[PDB]
Every structure is written in structure tokens, then in C-alpha cells.
Subunit: 60 residues, 2 copies
């Protein structure tokens, strides 16, 4: 599995276990991601902070 | 441990275990915190995201 990094033009291969790609942005600016990478369980989304996760290569 | 909430007007005595009050804001907007509460080890931020912790009475 491969996930993108903050900067889309780059990615990394997830380490054993972490079988997910996540995206993290503020509710205010949804199209402006601020965190990118691999993860085990999608972080809980609060009010102003959203977490989006997918299981495909470079989808986050 | 007096900890303020996402909405300053409110504050919840940070429960057992959690002995730190934090503020979560997006560097691009230091005054518009997006999260506040009780966290164990102050999460390590990045270039766009920032976490600030303290253990004083209503410090965050």
C-alpha cells in the first residue's frame, strides 16, 4: 500500500499493519489538506477537524 | 487541572491520567483554535498543524 504525503507529488509505502491512507483538514478550508500519510484506524473526526480515510493507493 | 474547552466560556477539570490542557490551531490561524481539551502526551505537530500544551490552572 502506498499513500501520498502532505505534498501530493510524494508518497510512501505504509509499514506493516497500517493499512490505510488518511487526509486531515480544517472544516473551514476543506480543500486545503494539512496532514497526509498512513494509519491503522481512522482518527475520530470532531467538529472543526475532519479525518478522511481510504484503502486505495494514493487516494488521500 | 482546570482545562478550557473549544469554547473558552466552558472548562472541564481535566480528568485522571490527562494532566495537560492543550490548544489545537492551524498555524495559518493561530487565534482560531480548532480543538481544546485533555491529552496525555502533547501530540507532535507539523508545518501546518500546531499543538500547544501546559499544566497550569486554566492555561489553555
Amino acid at each position: 500500500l502506498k499513500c501520498n504525503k502532505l505534498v501530493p507529488l510524494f508518497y510512501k509505502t505504509c509499514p506493516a499493519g497500517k493499512n490505510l491512507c488518511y487526509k486531515m483538514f480544517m472544516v473551514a478550508t476543506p480543500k486545503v489538506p494539512v496532514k497526509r500519510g498512513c494509519i491503522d484506524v481512522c482518527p475520530k473526526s470532531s467538529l472543526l477537524v475532519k479525518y478522511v480515510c481510504c484503502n486505495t493507493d494514493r487516494c488521500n
